[PDB]
Design a protein around this nucleic acid. Sequence first.
RNA 1: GAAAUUGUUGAAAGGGAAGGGCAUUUGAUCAGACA
RNA 2: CGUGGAGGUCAGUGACGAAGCCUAGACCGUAAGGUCGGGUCGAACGGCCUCUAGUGCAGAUCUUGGUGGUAGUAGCAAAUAUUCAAAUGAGAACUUUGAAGACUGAAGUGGGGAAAGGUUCCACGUCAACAGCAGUUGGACGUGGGUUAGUCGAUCCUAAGA
RNA 3: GUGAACAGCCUCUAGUUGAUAGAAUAAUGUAGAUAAGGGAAGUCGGCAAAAUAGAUCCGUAACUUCGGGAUAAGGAUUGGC
Lengths: 49, 107, 178, 62
Amino acid sequence: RSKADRMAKMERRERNRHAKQGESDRHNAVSLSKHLFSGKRGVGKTDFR
Amino acid sequence: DVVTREYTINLHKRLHGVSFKKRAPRAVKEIKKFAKLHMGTDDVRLAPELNQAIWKRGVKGVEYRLRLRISRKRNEEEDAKNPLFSYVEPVLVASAKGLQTVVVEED
Amino acid sequence: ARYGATSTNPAKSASARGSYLRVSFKNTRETAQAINGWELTKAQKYLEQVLDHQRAIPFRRFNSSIGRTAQGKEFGVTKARWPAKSVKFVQGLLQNAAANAEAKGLDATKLYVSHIQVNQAPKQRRRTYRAHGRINKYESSPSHIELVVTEKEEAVKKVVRLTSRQRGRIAAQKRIAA
Amino acid sequence: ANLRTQKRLAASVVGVGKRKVWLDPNETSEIAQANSRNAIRKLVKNGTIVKKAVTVHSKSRT
RNA sequence: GAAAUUGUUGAAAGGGAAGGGCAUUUGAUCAGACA
RNA sequence: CGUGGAGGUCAGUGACGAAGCCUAGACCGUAAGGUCGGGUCGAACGGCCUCUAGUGCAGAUCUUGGUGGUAGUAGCAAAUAUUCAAAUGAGAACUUUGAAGACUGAAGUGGGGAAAGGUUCCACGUCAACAGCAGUUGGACGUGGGUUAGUCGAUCCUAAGA
RNA sequence: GUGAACAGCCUCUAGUUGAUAGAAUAAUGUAGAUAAGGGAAGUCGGCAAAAUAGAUCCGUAACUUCGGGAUAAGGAUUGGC
């Protein structure tokens, strides 16, 4: 069991460095979001406040 | 050196121009500093009966003069302070004026 | 094993490490260079006084826009600060290295910190939220600590060529001078 | 110890809200052993948990 | 287990940038060679 | 001159250390580059005569991944507010109990429900991560327990409509 | 409870005490105020702020599709026992 319980701690490390709050946090970061960078904003109605 | 004394304390000159939501929490931090002055200790204990006496008129109606009793006592082993600590408890009196400091005798 | 480059005797030297310690790195660089090279018994009481706002840690490198205080006149720097959470780990390692020296059987009074070294660990990756739905990082900088204590040691013929003309000059003056 | 259970649980037995029930600090070991409603009836009536009767709202000036 | 980047030790320089070219001093350092 | 593979050749070098990497140590070529020593490492790789091509990068607001300066800085300031002792603990501004002080003030910070979520509900254990401070606590993590219908609903009927 | 009232303010039953904190009170801020004499001279412009306000009684113009205009304007008064 202590052989098996230490293998839970060995396999947990990679998710802790990425600050995953579980073994079930698989929220994926989009590399480049479309609304941030694709636009040209001139006189008129604009894309935000 | 166990010595129990009486004291008056002028809280009006210590709470001059203090924000109304921070008067009664500040008057508590004065007595821990005020018992540090006379007895020369850091760990100062306030009785729950004294906490009622400060806070009785809300946060913003702390009394002008209080009449305290500061008792210095021996402290227990494996405490990291030093073997002495104070203990501040209130004595209930008619008027806080007209009183000066008095050594309470021991028995 | 595999510390930094050390020039000392490994016979009379204990050591201690700390891996993946979740402190700030910029605070633990400075509270390691304040202590580097002191006597061991003087270093521990100093760190006991840093907690009580009696003596401050000087910040030399990571020190932009730090407020001033008067307690850095001892070291000659206006900028100083009292990083408390960094001291509570670093003096925890001095208690270890003092305990490691008693197992080897070294003196307590002669011992001094000779090497202390702190460098960056793998960073946390935590995220926070900003205006316009933008996602920027919000991360830590943990650090590895290692230190080595050492006893103090109470201590601190080249053949020369010359020409035949210069060989005569010494021989002539030795003949003349009484 | 942690006593959020028995504070909540004695409120259900006596039938009064959580702001009213009184758990004395001297019996901090005796109350923590009780983990059922059936023990709470015994702990109430021998005088460890009491009621704290109603705050006055007088109507004399009215 | 390379580079960016960082720590510690050691050497060196520093009056509003640094780095480069030609020549030599200074300190450190290094192979060749007479039998 | 250099790189990846091919046909030859040196009966080429190699676990007594092959490639790779580091090296203000040495030599050669005007140069692309070639050779040697030292440190690391552990298993295959060269010279020459030719053959072949997914063959050489500093730039393309280049592509994927990684790291800095700025910087321990901007900041963590709406919703009136917290205080003292005791227990628990290696540890308490933040957990639990008691004593105080206030607030929401019946178009509520209260008591239930429809969409919607799917075990969050409760107990026992327990803190590496998350809770932008902290943590002994949690809507976290680990293991289990828990929704009972002749009458409450669906099921039946029809509306605009399919 | 006050009041025309489910307004605003305070309280009882019920619930919460959560929103990073400690010390000092420089400038400039954001939010909220008061100001001698004069009263829009300020300014694109009375922007903003001040003034008036609930209630009973007296009183109400030009005009008008005769219904309105109208709370027009303006003027006296308000506690306690």
